[PDB]
Amino acid sequence: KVPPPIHQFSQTLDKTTAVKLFKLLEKYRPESPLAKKLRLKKIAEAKAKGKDVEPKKKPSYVSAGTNTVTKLIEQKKAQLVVIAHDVDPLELVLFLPALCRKMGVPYCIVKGKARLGRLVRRKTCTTLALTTVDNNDKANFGKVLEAVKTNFNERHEEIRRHWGGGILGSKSLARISKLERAKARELAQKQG
Amino acid sequence: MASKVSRDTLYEGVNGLLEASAKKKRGFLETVELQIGLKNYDPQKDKRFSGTVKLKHIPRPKMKVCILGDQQHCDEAKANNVDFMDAEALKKLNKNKKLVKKLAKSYDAFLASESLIKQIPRLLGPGLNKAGKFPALLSHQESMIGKIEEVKSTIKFQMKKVLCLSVAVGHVGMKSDELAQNVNLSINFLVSLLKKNWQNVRSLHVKSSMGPPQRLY
Amino acid sequence: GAYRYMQELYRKKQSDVMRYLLRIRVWQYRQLTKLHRSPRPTRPDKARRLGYRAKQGFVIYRIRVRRGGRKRPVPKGCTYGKPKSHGVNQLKPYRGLQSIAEERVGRRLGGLRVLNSYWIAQDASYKYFEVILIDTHHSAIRRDPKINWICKHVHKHRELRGLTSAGKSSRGIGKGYRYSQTIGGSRRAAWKRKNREHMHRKR
Amino acid sequence: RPVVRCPTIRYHTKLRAGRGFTLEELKGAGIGANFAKTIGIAVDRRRKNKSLESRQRNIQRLKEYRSKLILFPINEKKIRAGESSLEECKLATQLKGPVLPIKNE
Amino acid sequence: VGHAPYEKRTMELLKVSKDKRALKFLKRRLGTHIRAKRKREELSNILTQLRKAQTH
RNA sequence: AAUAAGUGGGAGAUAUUAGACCUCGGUUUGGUAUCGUCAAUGAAAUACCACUACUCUUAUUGUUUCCUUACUUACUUGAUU
RNA sequence: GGCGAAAGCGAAAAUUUUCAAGUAAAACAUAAUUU
RNA sequence: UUAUAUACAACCUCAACUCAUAUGGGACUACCCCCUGAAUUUAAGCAUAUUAAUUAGGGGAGGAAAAGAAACUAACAAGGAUUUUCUUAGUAGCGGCGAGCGAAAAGAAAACAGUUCAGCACUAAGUCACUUUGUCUAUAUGGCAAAUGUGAGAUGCAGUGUA
């Protein structure tokens, strides 16, 4: 009987919406490997004599990992939390919804912790963040937050009060179903 | 089983005291019959819950007082309109009737002299254990200074042996901002009459003569 | 950060969440071999606080330890001699069960030094733990001037000489009064020096 | 090695041998709390100085020495000495005398 | 994470039901007459933390 | 007035009605009213109005040395390549 | 696989992923197979 | 994409390798660290006690080890890591209160040295290990770069910081 802090996992943002989320997040892949060098190898040579601070244009990308994100929620800075559900053990992530339900920030739970790792170019990443409010994707940003607010956030305050669970299956299940498929045929003739 | 103005369950906070004036749904004036359920306060013992709650704003209980005077009661008490009698009304207060539309137990709080206490339970007492309006010796009955306060809402209350209370303390027709300083100081003067008190009762009760009982934390 | 949260969350063990997460984690860690390599630490916050980092190679193992007081292994046939010694079935070790865990690891993996351990789960016939080891010849630990001190020789087999954290427990070392006997260094070196006959040259 | 005032009622006066100099006494005496250790003042930051007068007893001890504590310069320009480089020890003392006495009771 | 069953079974002793026997139970469980004292104030607080916030 | 739970507040409430006023009920004023505060007089002065709670009552999600029957996922043994 | 603080073990083990002894055998872990 | 109908790509968990490179198992015994643990004896008997928290021990180290920078003392006019010696002291206490055992604070001296983590805030992984190409010299389980060549690493490495 898996206790209703689980399910929060694995009610995990059905894939009509989640494909649109990963279409958003690809622009916020964190840092290219080579272009990190290409950012700083031209600072080192060309902008050594330039010494500019203004044209930096800090790309506003995902923050990764829980201790970054759990900072970023208690500082109210994140606009979107993605937490995976395949976490081992669980406590790296387990409290994170009941933060975002308390701090108010809209969180989503997305299937795959390897899928999160692929866009941040590590093996596994378990939690992303979104501080980015640039207008080039703000239009998709609003409706994709209006999905997760009723899917998770406005759903969270009655997520916790529900767990049925302990499903038997299949042999022990269909036998007691086969109790009613025959014993009601004694109830079909007695009350008949 | 509760009404709209007399809150039963709701332990209302410090800002919802302003609705205590809303018990006046009648037009005639009603006497606020206070009551409380006491745990570990036995009235059969010497703990007789009887005192005086001197409150700053007077709700004017309609109280007639006969003042037995022997050169000590009515000499100073002309500033508060004492009756100025020489204790001769006690000769007719029992065993007979005074006039039409009048009883023989005709007060709310009795104040007696110190030198004529012997006739209070003997000739007057059989007319008062049948009445329950017996003057004590601790209900501020001396008339040295205790007559300016007597028309200034001196409530003398006697105890029932069935663990119910109903005694006039005032009215509810006036604004609860006047009762903001009244109920905050009366309940400090009621708990002084209690013994070893921190919290022996969970919740309080208050009730008018024509209204349902209010309750308040 | 998250690490303070999962600190506080592991503490609430009698709850409904953390009574299932330790119920499943037992009947995962029972159908395996008693000494066993885990990749990752189970509790990565108490892998921290105890000296683990996420660099190669900090190694972890899970041990089960058969859980109960020690029956004096006497041949069916008596602990002979005086009735003071006649006790068989209520004897209790002077070592832990956690220290007895680290031993059976560190005995077995002779070329890796032990750092600490932690409790991970238990059920009723097997208390069982999670030991942190460190190869002391990997270069990423030899280069490391924060972890380098375990590479010295004076730490060979550092808990078969009692010197981890959960080894120093059972000695009895501390200060002062309550730990007075024994204040010679360790615990046996106190009765050496209490009993010492000083045969001074100039009596 | 600072103190006076060994603890109990027997030795109200005969010293426990002063480990401390307890950072208020450094801060109360013109140094240089981290700096005092680099001279050799023995700064040991476990004592929670409980008296005015015990704090003064060592502050004036920290003023007696540091007034006789000669100072070698580093680069021999010596802009803030405070003592000298012609009281460099060859000129003035060079002693390394033996006891550093306690003024003893 | 929810409560604990020595507290969840002493909250039920603490609704009305003679919180001396709550104290005699936590000191039996926790168990030390200040830990039991300092646990009874918490569950007194939580039972009055639902006084109107959990109306609906 | 009995049979005032009782016993004290109270020394009249409440209701009705038209009038006053309001968009209106209503409250008030007075008339009237089952009693009664009053009188009827005694053990409670019964009206007006109660907190309390049982004789108990229906009903509510109660832990329980409960108990009984089942369930399987822990655990246990047996069987096969 | 186990056990024991260890050393070590009145071990016809009876559980230890392939815990196999294996074959000039095809694809998309050579096939019925050996505890 | 998972009627156990094929494939792909990840990840987790786990295998195998005469894979490339590494550690591990000494034996000594005086000292040292952890265990485990008698009985002879003494009590003029004897059973707790005593031997002795010791022989036998019995696993693990070093040139010393262990300890060690207060969850300490104390009650003062306050002390200040550990270890060792002197004294406290054969004392407080333990004990068939019997035989017997038995410490520490303070004082004196030897020597004296301090510190690092984890964890809120520290707000661009700033991080390591090899890998090949040079360079630097050496028998460097190296340095400087380079490809940013794998890999580790956000389930967090680094800097700053510590009761």
Short mmCIF file of N, CA, C and O in Angstrom, two decimals, chain A residues 91, chain C residues 10 13 17-27 29 42-43 119-123 128:
data_model
loop_
_atom_site.label_atom_id
_atom_site.label_comp_id
_atom_site.label_asym_id
_atom_site.label_seq_id
_atom_site.Cartn_x
_atom_site.Cartn_y
_atom_site.Cartn_z
N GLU A 91 14.85 10.15 -1.63
CA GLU A 91 14.87 11.30 -0.76
C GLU A 91 15.69 12.41 -1.32
O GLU A 91 15.72 13.49 -0.75
N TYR C 10 15.25 11.30 6.72
CA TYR C 10 15.65 9.99 7.20
C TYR C 10 15.41 9.80 8.67
O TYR C 10 15.24 8.68 9.11
N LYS C 13 11.69 7.93 11.13
CA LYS C 13 11.69 6.59 10.61
C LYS C 13 10.40 5.86 10.87
O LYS C 13 10.04 5.01 10.08
N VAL C 17 5.80 6.91 5.11
CA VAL C 17 6.69 6.83 3.96
C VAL C 17 7.92 6.02 4.29
O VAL C 17 8.15 4.96 3.72
N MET C 18 8.69 6.46 5.28
CA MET C 18 9.97 5.85 5.57
C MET C 18 9.88 4.50 6.27
O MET C 18 10.91 3.92 6.58
N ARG C 19 8.69 4.00 6.54
CA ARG C 19 8.52 2.63 6.96
C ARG C 19 8.29 1.72 5.79
O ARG C 19 8.48 0.51 5.91
N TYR C 20 7.92 2.26 4.64
CA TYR C 20 7.87 1.44 3.45
C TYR C 20 9.16 1.43 2.71
O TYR C 20 9.59 0.37 2.25
N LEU C 21 9.82 2.56 2.61
CA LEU C 21 11.09 2.63 1.95
C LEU C 21 12.15 1.80 2.64
O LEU C 21 13.10 1.38 2.00
N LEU C 22 12.02 1.56 3.92
CA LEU C 22 12.88 0.60 4.55
C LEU C 22 12.29 -0.79 4.55
O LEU C 22 12.99 -1.72 4.93
N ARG C 23 11.03 -0.97 4.17
CA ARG C 23 10.49 -2.32 4.09
C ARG C 23 10.82 -2.94 2.76
O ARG C 23 11.17 -4.12 2.69
N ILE C 24 10.76 -2.15 1.71
CA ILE C 24 11.20 -2.63 0.42
C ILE C 24 12.69 -2.80 0.40
O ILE C 24 13.20 -3.78 -0.14
N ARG C 25 13.43 -1.89 1.04
CA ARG C 25 14.88 -1.98 0.98
C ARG C 25 15.41 -3.14 1.76
O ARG C 25 16.54 -3.55 1.54
N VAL C 26 14.64 -3.74 2.63
CA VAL C 26 15.12 -4.96 3.24
C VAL C 26 14.97 -6.13 2.28
O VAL C 26 15.95 -6.78 1.92
N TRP C 27 13.79 -6.33 1.71
CA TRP C 27 13.56 -7.45 0.80
C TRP C 27 13.90 -7.11 -0.62
O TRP C 27 13.19 -7.50 -1.55
N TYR C 29 17.66 -6.02 -0.17
CA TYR C 29 18.97 -6.38 0.37
C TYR C 29 18.88 -7.60 1.26
O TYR C 29 19.41 -7.56 2.34
N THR C 42 23.86 4.35 -0.68
CA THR C 42 22.42 4.39 -0.50
C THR C 42 22.00 5.77 -0.04
O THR C 42 21.32 6.49 -0.77
N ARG C 43 22.44 6.16 1.14
CA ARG C 43 22.14 7.45 1.71
C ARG C 43 23.27 8.37 1.35
O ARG C 43 24.30 8.34 2.01
N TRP C 119 24.24 2.87 9.26
CA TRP C 119 23.11 1.99 9.21
C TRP C 119 22.28 2.34 8.00
O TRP C 119 22.08 3.51 7.73
N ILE C 120 21.71 1.34 7.32
CA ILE C 120 20.87 1.57 6.15
C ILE C 120 19.48 0.99 6.30
O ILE C 120 18.52 1.57 5.83
N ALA C 121 19.37 -0.19 6.90
CA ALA C 121 18.11 -0.87 7.13
C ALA C 121 18.34 -2.01 8.11
O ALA C 121 19.47 -2.43 8.33
N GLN C 122 17.28 -2.53 8.68
CA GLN C 122 17.43 -3.72 9.49
C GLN C 122 16.11 -4.46 9.50
O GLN C 122 15.07 -3.86 9.26
N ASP C 123 16.17 -5.77 9.68
CA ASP C 123 14.98 -6.56 10.00
C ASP C 123 15.39 -7.80 10.77
O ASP C 123 15.68 -8.83 10.18
N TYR C 128 21.95 -4.45 9.35
CA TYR C 128 22.84 -4.40 8.22
C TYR C 128 23.09 -2.99 7.72
O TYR C 128 22.22 -2.13 7.82
#
